[PDB]
């Protein structure tokens, strides 16, 4: 368990590890936005 002063932020911590993939998906989204120039 996290130190008592930060236990409230547990749901955010449970989501951080996966953020680095959303970047890879965002690259494709950006490419599709400009219509695959």
């Amino acid at each position: 368990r996290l130190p008592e002063a930060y236990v409230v932020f547990s749901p955010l911590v449970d989501v951080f590890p996966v953020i680095p993939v959303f970047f890879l998906l965002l690259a494709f989204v950006w490419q599709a936005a400009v219509g695959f120039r």
Partner: protein, 61 residues
Amino acid sequence: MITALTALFVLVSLALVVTVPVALATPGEWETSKDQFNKIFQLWVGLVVAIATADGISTAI
């Protein structure tokens, strides 16, 4: 205290994350707005230091 300071830290980080790339990408925005981003960076550093000091004081013996 710790939790309110960390909440302010999170809010400031969210605002900076949303705003910075828009300013950087658009031509001329970073040049004109190159006076408040320094203030926000100083606030960010100050929040980090304050959180560190408060956590150290609370945890130390």
